[PDB]
């Protein structure tokens, strides 16, 4: 239903960073990208890319930058607003921001193709965002249905909601034919699913990607994968994109300008070639070969470190494990929430298993224990 039949790259940029020369600096730069460096879909991100205390200034920055530069951005612009299925205050905040951003007197809306809504739940929560899009349109004299809605699938409920989208979109009490991208959010989804891994890295969730690809094909939407947060792992990003393309998920989230270029080229067929034989800078194949398996103490450390960064006005940071090499991973509030699971489980167990207090004290030490019991 939308102009872009295929979307290779979905790139988010923080809308307002603190410390500050120009808080809009990341948007002004991403707005000047061109050719293979520029994304099919660019997402100024007022949600997890942006510290909370910074989001009001972020939405002004969005209006200001797209005002001045959006006219020749060559991809499509769809900013991410705040939303959450379980928070009416957050829904209202994302609606008020969209309403400000599309005021036609401000010159941004003419260059905005739609908005991206995170944390949606079942289909009746998607109809609530849809109704806000309709109200915004009517309040600002835009054509009905002209702002595309894209959603981030980052809960069990939203994953199930993709099952009946075709007939729910047909109901004439909604305008959900405006739906454009269905985008996985593996980080908050890991959180919602309560998953954990020995390294703390994201599970691969092949079934989620299968279901988001199916859902888009059945409903006329386009499926995009979520963030590959080991931002320096060029080879990993390529292998993930190839795995995605075999599920029919041909687009991927990009966190950096370097990911944009890789993800723009990856699904393009090759120049020539090429026969393969399948019988059977050192730093880079070394990081490819090492992993760390953090202790309960390590986990709390990563969280406090992130906590401090966010409180200082930074939404997203590259966090580092160093040895012997230097392993980098993009952290934000989602990453923080997801990392907490092994701790929430420990706490549940301590609270409810007084008979195990002694072995847990043997296993951790009474000091590590009392620290864990403090978090969140």
């Amino acid at each position: 239903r939308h102009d872009r039949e295929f979307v290779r790259t979905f790139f988010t940029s923080p809308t307002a960073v603190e410390g500050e020369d120009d808080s809009a600096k990341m948007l002004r730069r991403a707005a000047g990208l061109r050719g293979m460096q520029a994304p099919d879909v660019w997402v100024p991100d007022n949600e997890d890319a942006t510290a909370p205390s910074m989001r009001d200034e972020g939405a002004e920055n969005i209006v200001e930058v797209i005002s001045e530069q959006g006219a020749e951005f060559p991809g499509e612009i769809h900013p991410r607003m705040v939303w959450h299925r379980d928070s009416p205050e957050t829904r209202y905040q994302g609606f008020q921001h969209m309403l400000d951003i599309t005021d036609p007197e401000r010159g941004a809306v003419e260059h905005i193709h739609g908005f991206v809504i995170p944390e949606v739940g079942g289909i009746d929560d998607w109809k609530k965002a849809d109704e806000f899009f309709t109200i915004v349109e009517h309040e600002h004299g835009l054509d009905e249905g002209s702002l595309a809605m894209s959603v981030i699938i980052e809960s069990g409920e939203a994953e199930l909601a993709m099952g009946d989208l075709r007939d729910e979109m047909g109901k004439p009490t909604n305008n959900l034919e405006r739906l454009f991208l269905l985008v996985d959010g593996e980080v908050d989804y890991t959180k919602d699913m309560r998953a954990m891994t020995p390294t703390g890295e994201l599970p691969a969730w092949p079934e989620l990607r299968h279901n988001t690809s199916r859902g888009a094909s059945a409903a006329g939407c386009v499926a995009v994968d979520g963030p590959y947060d080991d931002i320096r792992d060029v080879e990993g990003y390529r292998e993930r994109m190839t795995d995605n393309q075999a599920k029919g998920m041909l687009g991927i989230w990009s966190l950096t300008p370097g990911q944009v270029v890789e993800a723009n080229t990856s699904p393009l067929p090759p120049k020539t070639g090429s026969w393969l034989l399948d019988a059977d800078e050192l730093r880079e194949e070394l990081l490819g070969l090492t992993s760390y398996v953090p202790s309960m103490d390590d986990i709390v450390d990563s969280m406090e470190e992130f906590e401090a960064a966010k409180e200082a006005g930074r939404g997203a940071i590259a966090m580092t494990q160093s040895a012997t090499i230097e392993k980098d991973r993009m952290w934000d509030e989602a990453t923080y929430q997801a990392a907490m699971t092994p701790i929430s489980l420990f706490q549940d167990v301590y609270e409810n298993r007084p008979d195990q207090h002694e072995e847990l004290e043997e296993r951790y030490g009474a000091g590590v224990v009392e620290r864990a019991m403090e978090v969140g």
Copy 2:
């Protein structure tokens, strides 16, 4: 609900081939197969096995061969008609053909257990085919419900439609208790899902096979896997069948008489044996080890080559990649449609990304570019 509780082999045969001694030659031969050589379910295929210009003659051939030989065919006969969820002309054509085929004056219908319907969409499209079966029955005085319907699951919508089949089949406004096999169609499904792989070979779609197996168990149907189009790869076909059987999908499509024999034997338990130790004709293990990774140019070539074969009256052909060995893959219209994805994406990108025209010209050459922009 049907006589065959288990179906190992679902074998399709083209119903009318051009060039021509006897256009029915493939059906007359498949109709004489016996023992391990004969399939549990034999499908004379008026759809993708058969060139379009040939399908009217194909449906006559179906009546003629089953008339003369169907009496002692030892498996069940279920011919595939044309259908498509998005084409009313195609639905009507498949219904008119079924109506001709079951005319009891012609002596074919007494040896036909049902029909196979390709390209179904959501459950309301399955009810449309069901209604045609009911009309055919009544028009020709067959008992209501006596023709089995089997469907090919080869879209995202049909995959989702298997979720509520039990209660939709119970509604008394339909006769969908006639449902027999739910059969995956990986080739058109790859197309519908927009998937792609570096070699052009089919993705494995484990979740599709999981869901078709689940759907059959929940609704009282029997699940069958789709075609394994590397028809000479005996070892690959065996490994796929073993992988299927572990999902509860115990039947598989067969494209050749040699696949019939393999697929008839594979799920039978062994004669004796057998302990395995898991610590760690040359041409055949060589093809097992090589793959080709085609260029944008290669892709267009395979398509034009197929295009020409179909236009000459051949629906299915073995296409060949040669090196140094000879790699064979069954091609039909589905294969053609599926192969086009990397091209449709390139075209989308060229059309919508004028700012990338220059790097794409560097990457391919202006000649390769203008060729790609021509396809389909």
Copy 3:
């Protein structure tokens, strides 16, 4: 909605074993377990752990043991009753047993947090168990909703029923807000799905575990994996738990006191550590490396052996394959039902393929054939 936010271990114990000093012996012992040895959820099992002729005595044993010992059991107690979606007699039996067990005069109900229902089908079969819980509550003056219901997902229909649980639980004609655990039952599920493997071991069913984890997250329930029946394979159990935790399924069934300890420790984060490098008692790594691939004859043997054990008053047994090592697997009625698939398929084929009788006689011998044709 329930006190335990996380459940690591779900341990079943037979409620009545024949031969007999004290038929309650397994319950009395499991009831004395403490610390890391004691499960978060303990399941006295009146269903597949217990021979049928023994289940009336089993439900008395349940009342007697929990009466005397349940007060200081430190985990939660949820006994498994009999049930089946396709047997009204079995539903009624499980309800009469729950009604006996919760009589407040008998002193067991004060220490029971809920009951576990096996073999559920679609959501309307779950509402039938729910209604029995409500009747039991009212008949015995318990607070409405105070007995938790947990279900075992061990059919295709129940797997699909998890898709709409959130809104079905909201209907005020039911009390399904009492739902607590959604627990996979891989053994009966293998049966229901008709799956088979060359060794007879359980398929891994990653999608089932994905869907049960999703279903629990969407509906506010807790997801637990099914039994790991190679009870001596410590390393296998650990790898399965790690694979589960990456799907968000953080609990697992335990069949032995040794599994309880392993599964209690596995999802706890580590004491310290630990960097890994990924470039590349003998009996135990030997069993880790061998497998057996049974013949049609072998399969019947395992079944008759199990059949005899059950008829003698034993519900669960460790069955043994010996060579050269000793491979142990927990067998019960589910295992028996699941093992029969390769035989049911052979029988279907023999019955319906008279033209294959001769090759099947060549392949097996007329004696092996006539034996297979006798089973069940």
